Amino acid sequence: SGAIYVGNYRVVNRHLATHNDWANLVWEDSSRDLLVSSTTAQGCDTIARCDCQTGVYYCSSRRKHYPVSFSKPSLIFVEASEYYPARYQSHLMLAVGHSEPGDCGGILRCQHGVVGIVSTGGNGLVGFADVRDLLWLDEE
Ligand SMILES: O=C(NCCc1cocn1)N1CCc2ccccc21
Ligand SMILES: [Zn+2]
């Protein structure tokens, strides 16, 4: 589990969104596994605006933050899980890093701020959903 809290937005994995998220929906995209809902309180996270390929992510199944090298956001075939059929997921970045289902939502960050959240993984893979192209998270 986990979310990004930037401005009056909450960014979560679409497959983990709650009824309150769907009832206060700003934007969602199944191909990216992302959903954004509105919040009453302002958040403290800042979004990175960059092309970094190194950063650190939080792994809840190890209670640890790990430094990783990750690929640029791309369209990658991901295997069936409880939440999506084997399909192509867009804006996804891969790294070698330990992963399990309850980790979705952990933040990946670089020197500039939050880069994305954990979404896919398996066999020493972990795939993040990028948010650096969503410039509107910084305003309104
Ligand atoms: O179950 C999921 N993610 C579900 C969301 C998803 C995105 O694309 C398809 N399903 N993951 C995330 C971490 C992990 C480690 C080992 C095995 C699976 C998984
Ligand atoms: Zn960066």
Curated annotation (Swiss-Prot):
Positions annotated to bind Zn(2+) 1: C50, C52, C110, H112
Domain of life: Viruses
Active site: H15, D33, C104
Catalytic reactions of this protein: Selective cleavage of Tyr-|-Gly bond in the picornavirus polyprotein
Reported function: Cysteine protease that cleaves viral polyprotein and specific host proteins. It is responsible for the autocatalytic cleavage between the P1 and P2 regions, which is the first cleavage occurring in the polyprotein. Also cleaves the host translation initiation factor EIF4G1, in order to shut down the capped cellular mRNA translation. Inhibits the host nucleus-cytoplasm protein and RNA trafficking by cleaving host members of the nuclear pores. Counteracts stress granule formation probably by antagonizing its assembly or promoting its dissassembly.
Subunit annotation: Homodimer.
Name of the protein: Protease 2A
Source taxonomy: Viruses, Riboviria, Orthornavirae, Pisuviricota, Pisoniviricetes
Coverage span on the entire protein: 869 to 1008 of 2193
